[PDB]
Amino acid sequence: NVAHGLAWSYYIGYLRLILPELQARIRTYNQHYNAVSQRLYILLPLDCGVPDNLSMADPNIRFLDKLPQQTGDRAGIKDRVYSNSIYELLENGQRAGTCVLEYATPLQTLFAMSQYSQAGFSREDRLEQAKLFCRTLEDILADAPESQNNCRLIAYQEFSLSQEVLRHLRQE
Amino acid sequence: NVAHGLAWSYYIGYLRLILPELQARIRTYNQHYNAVSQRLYILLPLDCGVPDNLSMADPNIRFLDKLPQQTGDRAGIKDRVYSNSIYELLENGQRAGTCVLEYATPLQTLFAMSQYSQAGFSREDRLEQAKLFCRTLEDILADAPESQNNCRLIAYQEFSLSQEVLRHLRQE
């Protein structure tokens, strides 16, 4: 039942930190360039497949630009860098959306853990850990004060990813 | 018993990634500047106190320089940035060492988890989670192929931190 601690690491070490600074960072892209949506869209695939090149998972998802970096001194590292990537979502060759898009990196840790033998985590426990992680996250982000209209969880299991993201975007 | 998954996240998401590239990154600092020791020194305080300004924990530890950044495309983020900070360690006003020094950020997640109520982690379970994390890490790094003379764990409980680091440095 390792996912529960990974959900909290994900909040306490990242989301808690970048969400506050997020809308201010997005305004600055919109005003030093042309536009972009005001939430962090976090992809939770339940098969825990997390490719590194978002566009390699779907062509209709194309990288456009990096947001302005965030920096902070964290646990000895001077100027540690949180970066986020802006993606354009196409549909029938028309671009129908723009947002900050990314996977939930903890899901990568979960996949890896299920191959390494001394991690004591079976291959089959993956899908239920993925669900317990999405669930524990969702609890957190509901009560999260840092979280007020600034990120949207996108969990799914398998298909069009571009269509699946366009779904949530078209809801506000 | 959340520390075990945090140890693996720490290996699979960071150490596995930066250790390989580490000595090559250190050579480049030594040859585009004057020198620095060839291991990553990772601080594990067992009280899980992890300040952000390493020098605020001890004056005899002064920041000198950042290493050249590492970048990679990771889980949708283009050019995600791993940074590391080089510290000079003083003793009776003489600098007696230089290395890449940093805390184990998971220890920060552990501390935080023990204040948040819906994390189900008592204040008193901190010190044994800190020990289980140091232990599970040490297992990993022993068997870690990426790990061959490139990082040294420095666990401790309380005192001079500068003296404690100088201890391990003076062992090779």
Ligand SMILES: Nc1nc2c(ncn2[C@@H]2O[C@@H]3COP(=O)(O)O[C@H]4[C@@H](F)[C@H](n5cnc6c(N)ncnc65)O[C@@H]4COP(=O)(O)O[C@@H]2[C@@H]3O)c(=O)[nH]1
């Ligand atoms: N997309 C995205 N995700 C992130 C980012 N930063 C954290 N998360 C995720 O948030 C959680 C809290 O992270 P935290 O730093 O507390 O723990 C980490 C940390 F100790 C260590 N580590 C990783 N990078 C490091 C670095 N540059 N310097 C020093 N240590 C580092 O490896 C652990 C596992 O990292 P990871 O698998 O990447 O997932 C992270 C955790 O689950 C981000 O910039 N982008």
